[PDB]
RNA sequence: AUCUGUUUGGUGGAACCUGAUUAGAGGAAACUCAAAGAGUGCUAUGGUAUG
């Protein structure tokens, strides 16, 4: 009447509730932008809004184009350039050699718009603003940021080359 | 509960397969398993099965499409093979 | 625990000045109020609440 | 410079003399000397044609343990070099990054848990 | 396309069954033959598998379901067409009710 | 659809609301005061078993509501629920505040706010028939003016057309909204700014929310129902927006 | 459908045996007894099987259409992969003029 | 033991009551679970044997490569182990080091063999039938579940001739023949 | 100290002896605690003891 | 509990948690309760202190 | 020449209704319902990444 | 009909293949006993104790 095949009672490391590694155990397909044709983005129109990055500031200092003057000369319209807080913190963190670039960036026509995340990663902040809103054109010279924003459908890109500025994906430059 | 299961189950099956009741009316592709709790009511301004089989144009469409599908499958299957054997054995 | 809890930085005031803060005077009567003057020339009266 | 028996003997001379307690031929070498010399040759070829990290990963040792081992060894190297240079003796030339290699490291096999040098400072 | 006329892309039609063999209907082309050989090889593959299992049976296997299953005396399995384990045959009380 | 058809009611993902499956599917809320449609919509009726009674459900028209448009476009989170308190800024009439009251049900409450007095009279009559609603016929930029009527509401909905939308939301939500509390805004781009484009308006207003300490969780555009409109769902944080 | 010889089927192991139901001959009491409804439930069952058959046919045709589209997409994708691979090889072989 | 809070965790990063570091992954109890053995001593007797084979393999490795003694003795070892059944490939001497494991010996144990030959349906079932005395190896019955049956005796595990298991097996196949009183 | 703080030129307390305001050549006015491990919470008598 | 050779550590339910390979042949057990130390003294003439919170 | 561009434009407008969801006016008749079906498990809203 | 034989729904799941798991799994009882998470409720009150 007593049982067979008994065996001493021990721990189950593959199933225990107390063990720390074993303790822890409505899709979202986002709509495409209502302000987008197939690849056109018909809702960018003058006056333009343009996000600035640190590499853009630095190369603009090194090739001597004032931000608003050269940006107006490129697009031929009026441009509101925006520095985000993580970009301003990247500049301040670059520090004592690039302080003259910081002092160019702290300009009363460069409207600073705040950002709500932890850390100071300007690439991730700019890519998320662009993915959510489709109203800013981006200004940078970084290769990785250029590639991500090229893959994003319908967001015009803008760098600095030679002397003046260069835009890529605005269908009406002329 | 398991009461009125005939009419209620036929109506639930009809709504689950509602994308075949009408040629000009198709739907978003959803896999609708039978819910846990539900209620069946009218609209204030019979049953869906009997009004559907009381409609005429839908009935004619179901007849035409069923005859087409059944002639396809019966053309494929056995009876053909008996015809072939008989055609040989005749002469 | 005081090593693990020591986190001293609290924030900054606004966007800061535009050339570099060289003079600062706190209101000796009230608690939230200070006045900071830069090398730009601009002076600012500041709420710290 | 292309005869490889002699160059293999010149490279493995330190391990041979370390586990002496002369057999340098492959047939008559035995024990830990055999193990370490075979590992050294395989390391040389893989180093010539492989990626540096996957070739030379160290073995895992906790932080204060490896730092204590490094500081003890660096003190023995400083003492050895000071003894030689004080009572003047020429020593083989080591690079500015790496450690000296002494019979302490050949007996103890400490270059598997420390390495050639300190790659963080070398990267800086 | 690239450098090909339509007369070069002509569409040659296909011939039907010779008239004197209309009993043996429908001359079979390569598509029909390849259907035939595919199906025959599928059947032969499963037959080779079942014969190799029959070879390597090992007649000492004991599974517990041998107390519920039954095997026909000729050799095939038998199976209840009823689905359950219980509905094989009624008892006298439920016969009284059902009558 | 018609006057005699039979449908199957089914619980939606959000609690409180239901789907009426048929040959075409209808968004539905349980009617509180049964037997009278407010804005003339058709309404379903089931019979449930003491003698049984006749329970009634009401259709939700998204070409009239700007919240059923969000439900049908699919919002992951809507902070209105069967037991909460909802402050409804810009409550023109029953055409949306009655559906919100049927969603929050008899346990919760809804404070409807309107300025002009003819929709005020409509709101007063409908609120007399429906007890979850308390009506306010006062200007919505003055929570200090109506502070004696509201205590610690749990979500805010906004159908305000005025171009000070973010500031009026910030005032009411600092005064009354609970911490970690749902904010639901319906932005009309043409009312807020007519010259510049709708996407620029949307980015601008989400910036104003993030400045006024509401962390936006999501943003839908509700395109087949209205043009140039948007729904922003955010969460009122007050403590560590990052 | 294929058939296995009785020797194979008789020596198959327990796990891989084939279940076979013989078409019953006599009339059992439940089949003699149970009643079926006339006319209107009959039309209900007929209408339901019509609807289910139409739905199955429509589903199969749509699925096979999309499968053909999948094959087209696979071939185009493979050609694009060929181009990408060759361009990467030329990029690397070009790069090793700088190193 | 209470899912202690954040600062408690940073001050007690290194406590664990259930898993220490000498309980080497709880490998012993895990293998005892996998092949259903009855005592801790059995796992660690097998581990002592595997340790002895592995140190012999290491010393033969440290001998010079083209040694007749080395080749002879490593071949004797691989032949012995393959004939016993523990390792499955007679060709690799880095298997002779690497793949000799307690689980290899513990699955040449007897109820594993029965369960694999499909005499039983689980390894717990095989242990029960052995304990109740249905299994014979050769002509004499085996009562110990911890019997290490080699290959050439895996050719001789059978049912004891008068068992209800054998009666049921034959009776299911419709082949009982009570002249044998099977 | 912090990377973004160059050349501190002016520093003050706060008038409740709890925070420290520092204006630096960088152009920023920052505000620190005076004892880092403290928090500006109010505390039950059990935690305060 | 101290056993034939090895000390074993059991849960509140008899679930065996550990066996101590280093505590060979003990007859006397003890526990310093502020120090969280299991002391085992044996037939080997050795005396071992094993911290039971770390292991 | 412009007939091809006219037909390409209307082809692209049909593709746009296939991709996005466009504004077809509003209701003008009585609201009969969603003729294509209500779905529960889908959320076509752009989630704000933090 | 000793007619033929298709679709739909029940019963049963073999051959190959893909996952997941494995001291085989399922169920019950409850003012039983035991560990452990998630939340809710409570004036939950000495900024320095009782003149
Ligand atoms: Mg960057
Ligand atoms: Zn940012």
UniProtKB/Swiss-Prot annotation, chain C:
Purpose of the protein: Required for ribosomal RNA processing.
Places the protein is found: Nucleus, Nucleolus
Oligomeric form and interacting partners: Interacts with snoRNA U3. Interacts with NOP1 and MPP10. Component of the ribosomal small subunit (SSU) processome composed of at least 40 protein subunits and snoRNA U3.
UniProt family annotation: Belongs to the WD repeat DCAF13/WDSOF1 family.
Residue range from the parent sequence: 50 to 98 of 489
More details: Present with 6620 molecules/cell in log phase SD medium.
Swiss-Prot/TrEMBL WD repeat ranges: 16-49
Domain of life: Eukaryota
Protein name: Protein SOF1
From Swiss-Prot, chain G:
Compartments reported by the entry: Cytoplasm; Nucleus, Nucleolus
Transmembrane segments: none
Biased composition (Basic and acidic residues): 58-71, 78-95
Span list, region Disordered: 58-99
UniProt family annotation: Belongs to the TRAFAC class translation factor GTPase superfamily. Bms1-like GTPase family. BMS1 subfamily.
Subunit structure comment from the entry: Interacts directly with RCL1 and the U3 snoRNA to form a stable subcomplex. Component of the 90S small subunit processome also known as 90S pre-ribosome that consists of the 35S pre-rRNA, early-associating ribosomal proteins most of which are part of the small ribosomal subunit, the U3 snoRNA and associated proteins.
Function: GTPase required for synthesis of 40S ribosomal subunits and for processing the 35S pre-rRNA at sites A0, A1, and A2. Controls access of pre-ribosomal RNA intermediates to RCL1 during ribosome biogenesis by binding of RCL1 in a GTP-dependent manner and, via its affinity to U3 snoRNA, delivering it to pre-ribosomes. GTP-binding and/or GTP hydrolysis may induce conformational rearrangements within the BMS1-RCL1 complex allowing the interaction of RCL1 with its RNA substrate. Required for RCL1 import into the nucleus.
The protein, known as: Ribosome biogenesis protein BMS1
Organism for this UniProt entry: Saccharomyces cerevisiae (strain ATCC 204508 / S288c)
Gene name of the encoded protein: BMS1
Curated annotation (Swiss-Prot), chain I:
Domain of life: Eukaryota
WD repeat feature ranges: 3-42
Cellular compartments annotated: Nucleus, Nucleolus
Other notes: Present with 6620 molecules/cell in log phase SD medium.
Function: Required for ribosomal RNA processing.
Family note: Belongs to the WD repeat DCAF13/WDSOF1 family.
Subunit and interaction comment: Interacts with snoRNA U3. Interacts with NOP1 and MPP10. Component of the ribosomal small subunit (SSU) processome composed of at least 40 protein subunits and snoRNA U3.
Name recorded for this polypeptide: Protein SOF1
Residue span relative to the full protein: 344 to 392 of 489
From Swiss-Prot, chain K:
Composition skew (Basic residues), residue ranges: 1-18
Location in the cell: Nucleus, Nucleolus
Family: Belongs to the SAS10 family.
Assembly and interaction partners: Interacts with snoRNA U3. Interacts with MPP10. Component of the ribosomal small subunit (SSU) processome composed of at least 40 protein subunits and snoRNA U3.
UniProt miscellaneous comment: When overexpressed, has a role in the structure of silenced chromatin. Overproduction causes derepression of gene expression at both HML and HMR, as well as at the rDNA locus and at telomeres.
Function comment: Primarily required at the G2/M phase. Essential for viability: involved in nucleolar processing of pre-18S ribosomal RNA as part of the ribosomal small subunit (SSU) processome.
Protein name, UniProt field: Something about silencing protein 10
Lineage of the species this protein comes from: Eukaryota, Fungi, Dikarya, Ascomycota, Saccharomycotina
Gene it is expressed from: SAS10
